[PDB]
């Protein structure tokens, strides 16, 4: 029953809200639940010239996109995971159900 | 042999193989993270991708 559920989003607040919602659902389920595994945050960096020209001061701008990933381990079959994860999901988060 | 001479030049590589997604321009293309845009239009549509500017 070693299953691993990934949870990725652009946002931090809604990610932690849906993580705490799933954690309190598993705790009200009376099931052995593992904690959240905070993955290291990957940053996508793009530096480019602000101007469309070649005229002016040599000025650059910086673009970022942080990626946050969380892991949840559970000890239930797939239908319990479906019935606990198909309700009240944040629009920024995404899931991936695996079994191992 | 016009049907085999009109496209006789290979375009497997080089600058003409790449094309901009928005304006079909061969200049100033970014290939990082599979974006395939010119720099100016990436700056124009930078907000709705998710790329924010806070550094």
């Amino acid at each position: 029953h070693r299953i691993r559920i990934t949870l990725t989003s652009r946002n931090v607040k809604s990610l932690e809200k849906v993580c705490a919602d799933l954690i309190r659902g598993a705790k009200e389920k009376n099931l052995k639940v593992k904690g959240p595994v905070r993955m290291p945050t990957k940053t996508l960096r793009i530096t480019t010239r602000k101007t469309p020209c070649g005229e002016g001061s040599k000025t650059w701008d910086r673009f970022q996109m942080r990626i946050h990933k969380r892991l949840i381990d559970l000890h239930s079959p797939s239908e319990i995971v479906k019935q606990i994860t198909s309700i009240s999901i944040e629009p920024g988060v995404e899931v991936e159900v695996t079994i191992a | 042999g016009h049907q085999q001479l009109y496209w006789s030049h290979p375009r497997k590589f080089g600058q003409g193989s790449r094309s901009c997604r928005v304006c079909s321009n061969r200049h100033g293309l970014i290939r990082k993270y599979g974006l395939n845009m010119c720099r100016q239009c990436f700056r124009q549509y930078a907000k709705d991708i998710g790329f924010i500017k806070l550094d």
Binding site: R10, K42, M65 | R21, Y33, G34, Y45, D48, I49
Partner: peptide
């Protein structure tokens, strides 16, 4: 999925479809 592009490519493509 066999091709299985990366996490960064997923967000870049999602921004492309949204734009």
């Amino acid at each position: 999925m066999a091709v299985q592009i990366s996490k960064k490519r997923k967000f870049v493509a999602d921004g492309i479809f949204k734009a």
